[PDB]
Amino acid sequence: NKSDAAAKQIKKLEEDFDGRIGVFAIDTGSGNTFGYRSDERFPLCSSFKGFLAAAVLERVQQKKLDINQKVKYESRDLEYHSPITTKYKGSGMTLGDMASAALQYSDNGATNIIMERFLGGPEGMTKFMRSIGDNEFRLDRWELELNTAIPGDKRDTSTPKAVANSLNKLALGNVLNAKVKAIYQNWLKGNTTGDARIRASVPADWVVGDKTGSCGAYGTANDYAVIWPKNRAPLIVSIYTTRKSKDDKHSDKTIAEASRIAIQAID
């Protein structure tokens, strides 16, 4: 019905920028969902870093790791785009701060250190997702090589749907106890890279938590978000985009729009 109209508009939008748009959104109040290409594979980019953060908090809650434990890395050669790890190289950082840095500043240093020392690499990352009943998600490579975003390449991809369900399990559901879920929420709420994406699509007194991704190839970018409107149950929104050519740039505004259309569909 209204579902058919939102698909028209999404279709228009991707043809407008000569690329591919994938959306999944859920209204946690009514059970309403909407998907456009919600089953197709898209490159993850930094977006899995939000799940990494959750996988840590999981280990913390089972008492396998302490959120305050020093993590030192003074001799490491820090990957490109390590703004937070770089400023604390000489003192180190707590496991908590490191995890949140991976999520809030998309910190590559934070990402790889955590996966090599606590999470058991990409395979370990994949295993974490399998354990929340997400079968699409697959992280294969490390930063930065995982961001190649070659069309057709299934490495380091998921689907909008699977990303939506996962965020929902993690941000709103059963996986984390009350105390830890709260921490996880605040981490997403404090994300700094997502102002022009899903956040731009919502009334500015809704509370949003998000994690963005940008590949730097094939104009590949994404965002996923948990949203608390004012008088209303939260929404989950998940938007993934690619473009036809290698040199193409990502489009914040397209994701913004696709979020806008998505949210109207489940309204």
Ligand SMILES: *[B@]1([O])=C2[C]=[C]C(F)=[C]C2=[C]O1
């Ligand atoms: B994501 O996705 C990424 C990757 C790489 C770089 F350099 C940056 C970033 C952000 O997010």
